[PDB]
Amino acid sequence: ADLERAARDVLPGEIFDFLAGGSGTEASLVANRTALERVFVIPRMLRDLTDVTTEIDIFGRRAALPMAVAPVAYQRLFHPEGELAVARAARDAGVPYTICTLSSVSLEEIAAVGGRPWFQLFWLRDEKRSLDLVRRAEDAGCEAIVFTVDVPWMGRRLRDMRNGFALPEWVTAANFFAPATWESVEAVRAHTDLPVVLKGILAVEDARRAVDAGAGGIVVSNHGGRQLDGAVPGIEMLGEIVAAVSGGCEVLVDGGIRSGGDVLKATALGASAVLVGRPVMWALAAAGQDGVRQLLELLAEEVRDAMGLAGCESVGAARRLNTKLG
Amino acid sequence: ADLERAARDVLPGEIFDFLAGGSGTEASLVANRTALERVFVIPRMLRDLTDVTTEIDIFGRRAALPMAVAPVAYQRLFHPEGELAVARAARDAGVPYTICTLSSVSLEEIAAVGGRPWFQLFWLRDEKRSLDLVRRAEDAGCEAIVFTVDVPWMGRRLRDMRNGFALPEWVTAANFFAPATWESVEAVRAHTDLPVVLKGILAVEDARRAVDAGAGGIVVSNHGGRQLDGAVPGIEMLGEIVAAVSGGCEVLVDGGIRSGGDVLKATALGASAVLVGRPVMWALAAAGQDGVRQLLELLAEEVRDAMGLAGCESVGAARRLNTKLG
Amino acid sequence: ADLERAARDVLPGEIFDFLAGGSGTEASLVANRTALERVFVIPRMLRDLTDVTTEIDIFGRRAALPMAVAPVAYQRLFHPEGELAVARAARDAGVPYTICTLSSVSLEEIAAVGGRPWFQLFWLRDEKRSLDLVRRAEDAGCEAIVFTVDVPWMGRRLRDMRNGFALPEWVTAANFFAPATWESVEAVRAHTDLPVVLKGILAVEDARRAVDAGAGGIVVSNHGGRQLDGAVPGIEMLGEIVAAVSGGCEVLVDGGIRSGGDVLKATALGASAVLVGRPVMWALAAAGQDGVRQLLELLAEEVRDAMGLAGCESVGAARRLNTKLG
Amino acid sequence: ADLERAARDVLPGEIFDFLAGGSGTEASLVANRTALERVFVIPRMLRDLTDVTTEIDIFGRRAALPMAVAPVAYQRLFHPEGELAVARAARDAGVPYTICTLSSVSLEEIAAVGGRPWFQLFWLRDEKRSLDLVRRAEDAGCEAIVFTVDVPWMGRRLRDMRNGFALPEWVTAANFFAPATWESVEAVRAHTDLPVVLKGILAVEDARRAVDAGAGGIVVSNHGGRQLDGAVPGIEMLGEIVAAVSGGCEVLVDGGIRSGGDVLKATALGASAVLVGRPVMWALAAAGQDGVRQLLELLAEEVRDAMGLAGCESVGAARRLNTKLG
């Protein structure tokens, strides 16, 4: 959120491109923003705002905002403290932090920071190794398993191909693949008491099947435009998906959230909470832990401002706002 | 209306930005104009135009045009004569002038200019002080209380933050805050016989509740894009709101009105009248009282021209025009 | 149709602006083109094209194309031969030519060129003088009275105001105003056996009333964007109007026709024929009579090409084509 | 697919324009791309991808991808090996190749390359010569007759007119016209056992009549924007056409396909397969046979990538994907 310039200044171009890029022609990356910009909120007036609160309860825990840090791999690419800097700032802000399967600091180290860590799973070739990663995350105190379900394999990121981009030798997968199926979801659900959250759902019937499968939540998402190029933005499917699950699981959304007003739009369309990816990495690149803290404080102020201006004393009230496309 | 250049020439940049700016990304500021530009009128032909009149009756009084000067705070920012220059030109044009709570000349001085002064209220922390301001306005001969209902607090105007903009010491609140609620509306309605007009309504159910609450009018408005960034333009809610109140109160609109054709569009969508904000301040900056007089004469000619070209001998006929979105 | 550059090269700027301009912000001028560009034809294949003909019968006479030259005042502004050059080229092409009330050569001189002259009427202050002009036109052999019904007064053409544009002394109204009403239409209809064609109809109920009033035709038109700024383009009202009159009169359209493909679009939306204004004046400015001849030959080839490519052996078949908005 | 630059580098400008251009204002050429860009796919997740296959069965034969090389005349314009280079690369990729009536190498030479040759027919003035060409194609082992039905005559390609473009003397119609009708279709169908595929259908009723006429397939197509300027893109008619024929023939589409994601969009809208024209010629110009091979390998990888990311193990599954317009 205007820290993007600072991050472009400091990062090597090919790392900036790894962060910023999408797959193919980047149509789905651009559409995430276009779709949000077409949504207008219809605010309410003259309601009691004596106790405006941005807090929510999600997956058994209070969060300070309806927002979590999205899983983004290899955060030491952006700053030497990598995941620890981001997790510390998230903890201090009361925001859940999603630890990656491909984190550049081990999941146990990040969980020891405290806060509310979730763990994002990629399915390994091996049910047994997959479930061992889930068990590690649970043993370390992670509070939810965010199972990424839109990466049978990685999308074609043409910026990275044009750059011949590769992991610097000083960045590794500190926790150390086969396509996940509904059978994999069931194996995870049977082996943990943590809520299983399926990230990357766009079809209404997949959202309904996720509830039937025992998911505790879904993230309506086209993976920041990095997977199928031409995949619909999650924000365009969110309202239909929220209606189809009719309260059967938490429904989160991501893709393009860049302000507290955008958070308000997502909640007015029915989201329980959003994920935020690239902006958190911009803040990390620009100023480390303190950069991420400042970003989360700015987003917190913007969310409180937008809610009150729209007559909403709580996130639940914001979910009852109506919208109009423009 | 092309006086904007002259105003940019003369004003200090940070004052020009205070006037021109909106909140956040300015999406709602831009949308006010985009929304008007999508409306096309379907004109009628061959009707009697022997006595074309732009006059309306509103809040017990004749007005020369279906237009009033919007409340804009601190008009000495734009010209040394500030509010007195604008109120004199409005009086001479037969246009109501809305005196601000944050006027830079006292409300009694502006009311003494004559004309048809309305008074815009911000709710004070203190029902008693709020009602004393209403009583001052009524004692001074103001004809309507325009209660602003979309500012529980001021929006985030990033131009002003980037400029570190502050009131020059030579500008003060010459009449000298807590969020207004429906209880505040009732307190005002019980304490005045003047029509109470709620400015900043966008939701249909808030317009219906305003009628139920005893409002004499509403202004369908997103506050010139200065409050919630992402709030729908008033012009996009106007037709639905006019249908929902079904004549129970006057329905005004503002945001982006820049020509007599725009006034015609608003009336064809059902508005009783419009407010005009920034253009009046451009005229004031460019040429003081005579600048505002010339602006109002130009708008008067454009409204008469547009009405007649659309076959409308009266504003009521213009409200029966149909429109098409393009 | 790419002769516009040549015309801009040769004409004085203020005359070019008189020709090219619209009223107000020119929104309706631009919308005439935008609206045509959104229409796509659904062509038919494999039909018999052995005898493709672009001819139509209109107002009792065969025309070589479904097109007439629109009334454009003061054509000596564009070329020394003015109206005679255009009328000669129209005659030779088999296209009707509309003589203006404000022609710069007398209506009797232009009618003597031959061809199929129509006469465009502006209502004079005086029913008697108005009807005398109609009688002159009929005596001279004009075949239709094109009564302009969208000019109670002239629109505000800001290019001309900025230019301080006035008629050169070498251009006069060689045939030598009060707002026309439905009473005026009836006076004309009672005083001529020629078909009366009302030019400037946009509302469906005005098209139905025109049939009830005894009009032989209407021109669905916003006057090339020169009258009400913000008036809907005629092409956007054409289909609804054609359905409402259900064959009760001829329905023509104008505004922005710049190719034979555009003629095909208008006919697929239901027009009996189009008028063409500015392009004919470009051709006249660029190369006089021979310029207009070349323009009409190009339009004739483009209309025949478009019809055949869309599977239409006749203009009637083209009116049965379907369209899709894009 | 980014080989377009290389082709522009090497080809003479007027040959590049012959390849790239459309008719008229090129509205239909541009719309082919705009229309695809508005389509978003709704991908499915968590399905079995153990045996993803891009193969289809069409006109009695397996094809490696749901794609064929479109008929493009005079390929020696782009490279000295012309049609033989393209047909060899198509054969090696398992893609059908459409031999043109106006090929610059004889149809028997191209068919002898092997692979799966189809033959595109233009109707000759002479049923007997037309049917002799069909018999030549069948005798040579072509597997389908692609009867072009949208060229009663060639469209007006203004780039070629402005260039005064003509065939170099070193390029000839190595196989050596009157408008085709439904009678011509029947003559072809009665004289061959090969499937007859009507290329250039856009109207729903023409697609239904094609099935009734005994066509084995249709290509929903506006001829790459080269025939009627203003013709709807095929991709905008495809879904309605697929529903109307309800499995009665194969339904192909072309126009603007530039990636495997675009192939996925076409199949999600119901196409059995696509044709690809200009990109194959870019590859041929840039690098001959090996250029076309590399293009087809890239398209094959992109189609497999897009299918799997959208949860589709087969092309049939991709046809059951839903889409949303954006």
Ligand SMILES: Cc1cc2cc3c(=O)[nH]c(=O)nc-3n(C[C@H](O)[C@H](O)[C@H](O)COP(=O)(O)O)c2cc1C
């Ligand atoms: C560099 C980068 C790496 C990853 C790695 C992962 C990952 O190992 N697992 C996963 O499940 N999602 C990922 N993502 C998607 C992310 O979690 C959000 O879906 C989008 O970034 C939301 O959009 P923005 O807020 O970024 O627009 C990534 C996004 C970016 C930019």
Ligand SMILES: Cc1cc2cc3c(=O)[nH]c(=O)nc-3n(C[C@H](O)[C@H](O)[C@H](O)COP(=O)(O)O)c2cc1C
């Ligand atoms: C500098 C500036 C100050 C104020 C202060 C106030 C205010 O103390 N009370 C209120 O109730 N409305 C205000 N407004 C909104 C105004 O009354 C109109 O809502 C919009 O200006 C209509 O849009 P434009 O005609 O300007 O597009 C302002 C608008 C501008 C530009």
Ligand SMILES: Cc1cc2cc3c(=O)[nH]c(=O)nc-3n(C[C@H](O)[C@H](O)[C@H](O)COP(=O)(O)O)c2cc1C
């Ligand atoms: C310079 C100029 C003068 C006139 C004078 C007249 C007029 O004395 N009577 C009338 O009834 N219509 C007029 N018109 C409108 C014209 O008849 C067509 O309605 C539009 O030009 C159609 O649009 P284009 O083909 O020009 O887009 C004019 C148009 C132009 C440009």
Ligand SMILES: Cc1cc2cc3c(=O)[nH]c(=O)nc-3n(C[C@H](O)[C@H](O)[C@H](O)COP(=O)(O)O)c2cc1C
């Ligand atoms: C230079 C050029 C020549 C021809 C000659 C023919 C032809 O003798 N017969 C036919 O039946 N279609 C043709 N076409 C259309 C082609 O078959 C495809 O319909 C479009 O090229 C699809 O669009 P793109 O993939 O090109 O967008 C051509 C296209 C181009 C560009």
Ligand SMILES: O=C(O)C(=O)c1ccccc1
């Ligand atoms: O999932 C991703 O989007 C991503 O960019 C990525 C790249 C490498 C490893 C893991 C994730």
Ligand SMILES: O=C(O)C(=O)c1ccccc1
């Ligand atoms: O209400 C407003 O929009 C506004 O700009 C303002 C700013 C300072 C004081 C009062 C109003």
Ligand SMILES: O=C(O)C(=O)c1ccccc1
């Ligand atoms: O009718 C017109 O549009 C027009 O431009 C005009 C101007 C002067 C005289 C007559 C018509």
Ligand SMILES: O=C(O)C(=O)c1ccccc1
């Ligand atoms: O069919 C075509 O589009 C085309 O361009 C063409 C041109 C010359 C000969 C054959 C086809």
Ligand SMILES: [Mg+2]
């Ligand atoms: Mg996001």
Ligand SMILES: [Mg+2]
């Ligand atoms: Mg306004």
Ligand SMILES: [Mg+2]
């Ligand atoms: Mg026209």
Ligand SMILES: [Mg+2]
């Ligand atoms: Mg194609």
